[PDB]
């Protein structure tokens, strides 16, 4: 729900 | 939700099966944001998108940059815990 900074476009990594 | 501690079992010729993002540069925890159908994380079943890992055997991921974390997490072997969150 809604906005929250964790889901916002970041740099990620495949592990 | 509540803290959880979840089990993951590695094989040695796997990865984790997670996609993480977030960090400290970023002020955001480290985040799963995939997880990758049939491999470790996925087969556990304890584990969720959206889902900060705050500690990896009881290594504490909740103030270090992305690639710290990423380090940290692929050195990981066998019967791993993961110290989980939801946000």
Known sequence: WXFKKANSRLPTSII | ?87
Request: charged content about 25%.
């Open chain 2, 1 to 87: 939700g509540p803290i959880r501690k979840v089990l993951l079992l590695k094989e040695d010729h796997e990865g984790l099966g997670i996609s993480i993002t977030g960090g400290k540069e970023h002020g955001v925890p480290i985040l799963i944001s995939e997880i990758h159908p049939g491999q470790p994380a996925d087969r556990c079943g304890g584990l969720h998108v959206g889902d900060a890992i705050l500690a990896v055997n009881g290594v504490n991921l909740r103030d270090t940059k992305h690639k710290e974390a990423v380090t940290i997490l692929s050195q990981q072997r066998g019967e791993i815990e993961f110290e989980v969150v939801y946000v």
